[PDB]
Structure 1
Amino acid sequence: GSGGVGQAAIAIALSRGCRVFTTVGSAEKRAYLQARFPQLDETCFANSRDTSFEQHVLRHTAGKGVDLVL
């Protein structure tokens, strides 16, 4: 959601009240996003340099998973 289509894909989904889970490479990118979209918890953010995000998404999902992946 740091990137181009991410940023939009976030805005679109948020418009419709969807629980968002975005992943990001850089500390400072967490920053920007958090500012811009205020509706974002810290639970929303996982990593992208990595596979870590599967774990992270499986926690706050209660091993249920997500409805759509972009």
Structure 2
Amino acid sequence: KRAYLQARFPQLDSTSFANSRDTSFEQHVLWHTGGKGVDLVLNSLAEE
């Protein structure tokens, strides 16, 4: 799926992907954003 998204959307980079099966994406977003976070979030995910 990472490969497919990269193929369809060239503007994305290796740092614009995280993992949706665990809660590891929080650390990714916080690290790459400088700790500020994100402005919009679109969340079709579960409790944890």
Name the one with the larger strand percent: 1
Q: In structure 1, the residue corresponding to 2:30 is in which secondary structure?
A: helix
> How far is the alpha carbon of 1:53 from its aligned partner?
0.2
Among all aligned residue pairs of Structure 1 and Structure 2, give the percentage whose two residues are the same amino acid: 90
Instruction: Give the Cα–Cα distance (whole angstroms) in 2 for the partners of residues 59 and 38 of structure 1.
Output: 23
RCO (CA 8 Å, sep 6+): is it higher in 1 or 2? 1
> How far is the alpha carbon of 1:35 from its aligned partner?
0.4
Q: Cα deviations across residues 25-61 of structure 1 (Å, max 9, x unaligned)?
A: xxxx001000000000111000000000000000111
Name the one with the larger helix percent: 1
Q: TM-score, normalised by structure 2?
A: 0.83
Whether 2:27 is the aligned partner of 1:55: answer: yes
Gaps of 5+ in 2: 42-48
Runs of at least 4 residues of structure 1 off by over 3 A?
none
